[PDB]
Amino acid sequence: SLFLIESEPSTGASVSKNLTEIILIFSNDINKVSQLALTDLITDSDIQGIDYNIEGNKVIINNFSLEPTCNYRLSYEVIDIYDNHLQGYIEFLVNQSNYPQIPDQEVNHTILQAFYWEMNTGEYATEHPEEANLWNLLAERAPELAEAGFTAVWLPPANKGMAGIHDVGYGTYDLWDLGEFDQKGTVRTKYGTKGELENAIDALHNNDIKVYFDAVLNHRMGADYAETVLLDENSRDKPGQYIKAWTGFNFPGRNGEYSNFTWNGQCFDGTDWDDYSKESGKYLFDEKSWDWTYNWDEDYLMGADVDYENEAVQNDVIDWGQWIINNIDFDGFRLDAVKHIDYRFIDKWMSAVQNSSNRDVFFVGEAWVEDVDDLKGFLDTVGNPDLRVFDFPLRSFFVDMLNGAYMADLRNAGLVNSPGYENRAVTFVDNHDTDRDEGSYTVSIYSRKYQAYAYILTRAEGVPTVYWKDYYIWEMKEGLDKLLTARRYYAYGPGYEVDNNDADIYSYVRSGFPDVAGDGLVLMISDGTSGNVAGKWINSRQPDTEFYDLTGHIKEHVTTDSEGYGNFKVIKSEDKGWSIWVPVE
Ligand SMILES: OC[C@H]1O[C@@H]2O[C@H]3[C@H](O)[C@@H](O)[C@@H](O[C@H]4[C@H](O)[C@@H](O)[C@@H](O[C@H]5[C@H](O)[C@@H](O)[C@@H](O[C@H]6[C@H](O)[C@@H](O)[C@@H](O[C@H]7[C@H](O)[C@@H](O)[C@@H](O[C@H]1[C@H](O)[C@H]2O)O[C@@H]7CO)O[C@@H]6CO)O[C@@H]5CO)O[C@@H]4CO)O[C@@H]3CO
Ligand SMILES: OC[C@H]1O[C@H](O[C@H]2[C@H](O)[C@@H](O)[C@@H](O[C@H]3[C@H](O)[C@@H](O)[C@@H](O[C@H]4[C@H](O)[C@@H](O)[C@@H](O)O[C@@H]4CO)O[C@@H]3CO)O[C@@H]2CO)[C@H](O)[C@@H](O)[C@@H]1O
Ligand SMILES: OC[C@H]1O[C@H](O[C@H]2[C@H](O)[C@@H](O)[C@@H](O[C@H]3[C@H](O)[C@@H](O)[C@@H](O[C@H]4[C@H](O)[C@@H](O)[C@H](O)O[C@@H]4CO)O[C@@H]3CO)O[C@@H]2CO)[C@H](O)[C@@H](O)[C@@H]1O
Ligand SMILES: [Ca+2]
Ligand SMILES: [Ca+2]
Ligand SMILES: [Ca+2]
Ligand SMILES: [Ca+2]
Ligand SMILES: [Ca+2]
Ligand SMILES: [Ca+2]
Ligand SMILES: [Ca+2]
Ligand code: NA
Numbered sequence: 001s002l003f004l005i006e007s008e009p010s011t012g013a014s015v016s017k018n019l020t021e022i023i024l025i026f027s028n029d030i031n032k033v034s035q036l037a038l039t040d041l042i043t044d045s046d047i048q049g050i051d052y053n054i055e056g057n058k059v060i061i062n063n064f065s066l067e068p069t070c071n072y073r074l075s076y077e078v079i080d081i082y083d084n085h086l087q088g089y090i091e092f093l094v095n096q097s098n099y100p101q102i103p104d105q106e107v108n109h110t111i112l113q114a115f116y117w118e119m120n121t122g123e124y125a126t127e128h129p130e131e132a133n134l135w136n137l138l139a140e141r142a143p144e145l146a147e148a149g150f151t152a153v154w155l156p157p158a159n160k161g162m163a164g165i166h167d168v169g170y171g172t173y174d175l176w177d178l179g180e181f182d183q184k185g186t187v188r189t190k191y192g193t194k195g196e197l198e199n200a201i202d203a204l205h206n207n208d209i210k211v212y213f214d215a216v217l218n219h220r221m222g223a224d225y226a227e228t229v230l231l232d233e234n235s236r237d238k239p240g241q242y243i244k245a246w247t248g249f250n251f252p253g254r255n256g257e258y259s260n261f262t263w264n265g266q267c268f269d270g271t272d273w274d275d276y277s278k279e280s281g282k283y284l285f286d287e288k289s290w291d292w293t294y295n296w297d298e299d300y301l302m303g304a305d306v307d308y309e310n311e312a313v314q315n316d317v318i319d320w321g322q323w324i325i326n327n328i329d330f331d332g333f334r335l336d337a338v339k340h341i342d343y344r345f346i347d348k349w350m351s352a353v354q355n356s357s358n359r360d361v362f363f364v365g366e367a368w369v370e371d372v373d374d375l376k377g378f379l380d381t382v383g384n385p386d387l388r389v390f391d392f393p394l395r396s397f398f399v400d401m402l403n404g405a406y407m408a409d410l411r412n413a414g415l416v417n418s419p420g421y422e423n424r425a426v427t428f429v430d431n432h433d434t435d436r437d438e439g440s441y442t443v444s445i446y447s448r449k450y451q452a453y454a455y456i457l458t459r460a461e462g463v464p465t466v467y468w469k470d471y472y473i474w475e476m477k478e479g480l481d482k483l484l485t486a487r488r489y490y491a492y493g494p495g496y497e498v499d500n501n502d503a504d505i506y507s508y509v510r511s512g513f514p515d516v517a518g519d520g521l522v523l524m525i526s527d528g529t530s531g532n533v534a535g536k537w538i539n540s541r542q543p544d545t546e547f548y549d550l551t552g553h554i555k556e557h558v559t560t561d562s563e564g565y566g567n568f569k570v571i572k573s574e575d576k577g578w579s580i581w582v583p584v585e
Pocket of ligand 4: 019020
């Protein structure tokens with residue numbers, strides 16, 4: 001049977017105006033091309049002078065000159081070598097070639113979560129061997145990351161972990177060993193050596209991209225030795241009993257370089273394993289107490305739990321964070337499990353690190369709290385104005401959307417919309433905990449994921465994060481790149497909600513800067529599935545201006561009137577239910 005195997009470009013693709021040919025590849029060798037046309041869908045003219053050439057089962061069409069921003073359809077009719085006839089078409093959109101000129105100091109900020117759980121495991125290792133050396137790979141990709149829009153990269157924890165070469169990096173062993181010493185069975189971390197890391201940092205900075213460290217400060221695991229520890233009488237398990245606790249860390253492969261501090265029982269409030277009885281529980285150590293946290297009794301999570309009331313421990317961890325910034329030249333931190341750590345210490349440390357250099361260091365805590373008011377309360381409890389947090393409250397709306405949400409309520413969802421708190425929000429759709437193969441803590445955002453990135457990426461407040469697994473592994477890049485273009489070049493000036501959202505459609509306006517030509521945008525996202533195009537009368541804030549949809553989904557333009565209003569459009573489907581309308585000039 002006759003049918004199109006594939007094409008270049010693929011249907012729905014966005015291409016350069018420098019594209020010279022289109023190739024269609026069919027299932028049988030071709031005999032005739034009876035009909036063929038390349039149509040500009042906006043002015044409805046077929047381009048004259050196009051040419052073609054048959055090479056067995058492929059057909060190559062050329063001899064045209066594409067216009068930036070236009071939408072095109074290539075129509076065909078072919079007859080194969082068995083006298084089968086086939087009628088079809090592909091369509092596409094041509095990138096803009098003169099984008100708005102946004103001054104450096106004002107370009108939007110965007111972050112890449114540069115990892116996922118299963119990297120270099122299973123079939124991931126097979127299909128993506130480049131990811132066996134991530135530090136090397138980032139140095140390599142830095143230029144194209146910069147071209148994509150990214151201004152920062154959050155790295156996985158870069159220090160040695162208890163699982164050695166297999167530690168995704170949360171099993172924290174030695175913070176001062178960035179893949180440089182023979183510890184835990186490897187010299188390198190899972191991601192590469194210290195050298196490679198330093199090299200990656202330079203490359204990234206070379207292309208104007210910031211580098212954040214994923215600081216895991218809550219616990220330690222992988223002790224060099226065990227000690228006999230008496231448990232406090234108000235311990236929840238085995239009160240007043242002697243246990244054998246893995247609490248001795250001397251880091252022998254490192255031999256005192258950078259810091260000669262060593263760890264024992266007196267550096268921890270407790271642990272979750274007793275090697276006499278071989279039994280888990282939650283074991284508080286004699287005369288220790290859990291540190292002050294936002295919610296009651298949330299200091300213990302896993303591992304030997306660090307005692308941040310201990311001054312010698314406080315002082316080493318403050319030194320390390322100054323080193324990461326001023327010596328190894330990182331630009332900021334993600335704070336892991338930030339709600340299980342003495343909030344007095346998080347403020348003290350953030351402040352000591354920040355005051356230590358003139359660069360304006362950047363801090364985002366993982367405080368996994370899904371109500372906005374709880375999360376506000378957390379940020380008020382810590383009391384450090386530099387602390388931003390991931391917007392788990394907003395992601396809860398994206399989980400709602402999996403089976404249908406009330407789309408109008410996006411006007412008020414997340415920290416990113418709490419007056420007084422909007423710019424402390426780091427917004428995101430998934431991550432290594434929310435989307436993982438086995439053992440995941442929640443359901444991933446497996447449907448309407450593009451609608452969700454389109455929302456965070458176009459928004460005037462917060463700083464959005466793209467998940468590596470989404471961009472490179474799940475095959476969403478082509479789509480994501482169009483939304484990164486929107487953010488890089490168009491998502492500027494005031495934001496405006498509109499007055500006609502509903503159960504199924506949310507729209508939003510960026511007016512553009514008033515002294516930059518050609519910027520601004522109108523977003524429409526939808527949870528509709530009816531399969532049809534739908535319009536909304538919106539004020540764009542740009543009178544008498546021609547707009548087009550840079551997603552390529554709608555093949556019309558919209559010209560605003562003397563007040564700025566136009567009837568902008570979206571497709572009601574899971575799969576294409578996002579459109580970003582921007583100016584043609
Ligand atoms: O297949 C088993 C195991 O394999 C892998 O563990 C590695 C690990 O990655 C290596 O670093 C090394 O471990 C060393 C430590 O570096 C060293 O400090 C010490 O470890 C002690 C721990 O500090 C302490 O927690 C305790 O471990 C208990 C543990 O708390 C219990 O929960 C139970 O372990 C279970 C694991 O939790 C579970 O995930 C799995 O283990 C894997 C692990 O995922 C992987 O990283 O199953 C086990 C239960 O079968 O029991 C243990 C004790 O029985 O005490 C340990 C010392 O006993 O010493 C270890 C070396 O023994 O090597 C391991 C093994 O390959
Ligand atoms: O182009 C089609 C679709 O594009 C987008 O889908 C994306 C998802 O948003 C990504 O998250 C990922 O999907 C993963 C998913 O994350 C992962 O858990 C697993 O899916 C399970 C899922 O957990 C489970 O709840 C159940 O429903 O079955 C699934 C099947 O395994 O694997 C998915 C990958 O297959 O990648 C997809 C595809 O790119 C967009 O969200 C959709 O709107 C669109 O249809
Ligand atoms: O040290 C490295 C590990 O920690 C990191 O991620 C973990 C979180 O920091 C930790 O808080 C915990 O998260 C749980 C929440 O504390 C808990 O509240 C719950 O979330 C609720 C939510 O608050 C509620 O409103 C909602 O409706 O339901 C949720 C759960 O049903 O679950 C959270 C997940 O357990 O554990 C985190 C995940 O491991 C690192 O990023 C992680 O990779 C490391 O292992
Ligand atoms: Ca051309
Ligand atoms: Ca803790
Ligand atoms: Ca304590
Ligand atoms: Ca500073
Ligand atoms: Ca729902
Ligand atoms: Ca709806
Ligand atoms: Ca403007
Ligand atoms: Na503690």
